[PDB]
Amino acid sequence: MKSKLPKPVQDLIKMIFDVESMKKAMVEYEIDLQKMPLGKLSKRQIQAAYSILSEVQQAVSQGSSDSQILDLSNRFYTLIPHDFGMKKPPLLNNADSVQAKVEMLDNLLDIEVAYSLLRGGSDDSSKDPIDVNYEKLKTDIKVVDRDSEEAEIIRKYVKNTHATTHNAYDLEVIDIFKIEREGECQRYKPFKQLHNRRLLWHGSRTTNFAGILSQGLRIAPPEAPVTGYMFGKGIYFADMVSKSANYCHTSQGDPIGLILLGEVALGNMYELKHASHISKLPKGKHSVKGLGKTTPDPSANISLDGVDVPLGTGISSGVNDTSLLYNEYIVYDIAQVNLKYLLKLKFNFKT
Amino acid sequence: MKSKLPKPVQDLIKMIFDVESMKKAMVEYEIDLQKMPLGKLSKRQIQAAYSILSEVQQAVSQGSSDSQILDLSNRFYTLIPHDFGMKKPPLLNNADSVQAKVEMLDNLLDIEVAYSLLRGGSDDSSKDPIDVNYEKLKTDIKVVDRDSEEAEIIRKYVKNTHATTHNAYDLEVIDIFKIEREGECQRYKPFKQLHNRRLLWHGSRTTNFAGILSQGLRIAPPEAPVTGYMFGKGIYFADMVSKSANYCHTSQGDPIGLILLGEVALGNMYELKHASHISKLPKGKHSVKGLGKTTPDPSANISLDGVDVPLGTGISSGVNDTSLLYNEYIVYDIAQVNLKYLLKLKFNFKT
């Protein structure tokens, strides 16, 4: 037999469970596949890499030992064998290169999760590869009818909240999905009637979604460095679709992007303007909001599900002083999130 | 007519007002005294630079390339011209670049005042150069007696809290001064009975004190960038004496230094492990305490003026994954500072 699932859902399955995507991703980070193939990648290898980053974090603040900073930077490339050709490997000596690497490792973690879930579970040849992988995702994925007003709303969300400055592309909705991950309905219960609930985007690289649908969105591991993530070890969302759409890291080769809508229990937002690395919040606040100059228009806010959907146009909130152009909201407890809709998108680049 | 004041107070006045020390301190910041002499300084000149730093802060955080950020780095040097040997103008393009040039302007502002005071007054050849300048400070400086228990309290507090990581030099007390700025006790009235009030170290470069005694301690202006300081714009402190003493920035060429002892209404503390650039606390909080790896023994505290004087030996606090070797405290409200003692110290080096 062959799969009897909806056709766009099948396409989605072959997208996130894609080997050549995974091998290509490691090459984008200029990694030696001969010394380190996809098979020999592991979970703790990365945890160790994270500790190397945590080491450098401490090394910079806790005194001035720039000698060691090299030896650890060099040790990183030993841990994760790269192949730049003739070019110099970028020195890990500051906040930029630190931040740079954690994002890779976060992706590497998700690829290990994906390939482990691919080789995980059961051998059943009499079924189809698609049905098998679907059942491994632990997620009911329904195609949303493009008529349904929720779709129209979703379109009006994306349509308006494309920011002007991110001019390199423009967007359109290929496929929408009503995902339901097993357990998250119960996990989200304690924050269900917490005040100030907003539907927000989470953008991510195609392949990660295998891990993002099986295990949900997670906080960085204990090994990870807090300085590597601007606001710290939480989970990052945006109200503008373009902001998250950049975190799809779409290319000319890979123009199709996946992005999520998610119900987040924010409540009392620790309103901030600049970087502030932290593991936990003060007694009172339940989340952070990085305030940006541009923002979705507040008068155009609405309520589907009894939840806020700010889909107004980008307007200049009179925000004196900020490192961020656009807004972003961050919660630091994984239960505070409930995922709703997954959107396959098309990035048509300009010339 | 010669002065009525004590010898120690006279040598103190001279030291801070020594113009040649100011001229000298500006050279350490690579300032060109041809294009930017001491006389040609002004308040807005420096505040204009702060705005341009604040503009780079964003340029840096958003990863604008070396060809783009070029213009902003030269814009800064345009305002404040520098003496670069025979070099090309060094590119300002990271956190430290900012942090370094931020701590510069602080001084430039504090030095401006000193030069502004020497000149902004009435001269009189009959009256003493010193006494006239003592008037300018608006401070009732009194020489502490060597025996009085308060002297012996300070001696031990200084004696014990010299950190092992800063042992390249070793300090000894020369002079101690009980001080009271005019009106400063009026400012403290609301906070004088607040819970958790401590006496803490605050050491700045010799040349700044004129402005500190005149204006009181000060937070950075509105124009300044928040990312120039580890915990944003405020009033920093320390419970370890060597830590604060390092910002006197003494050397073999200038082994004389000054350092303060201010009462601080910490109250409810927002404890933190890592860099958190802010200009406003979470509600309920009054001060910030950086969680140090090392702490003055909790059981070795005593009361003077009903204030918590922390003068124990150095021990491990028992904190994992922190960026601070020792506690540094930051209040974000001028009103929560009251100055009590100013010490003159010889920095005896191990050359």
Ligand SMILES: CN(C)CCC=C1c2ccccc2CCc2ccccc21
């Ligand atoms: C003139 N006044 C306002 C100086 C402020 C106080 C300090 C200081 C002193 C002791 C411990 C920490 C800090 C914080 C950092 C810092 C950086 C540069 C210059 C001074 C300072």
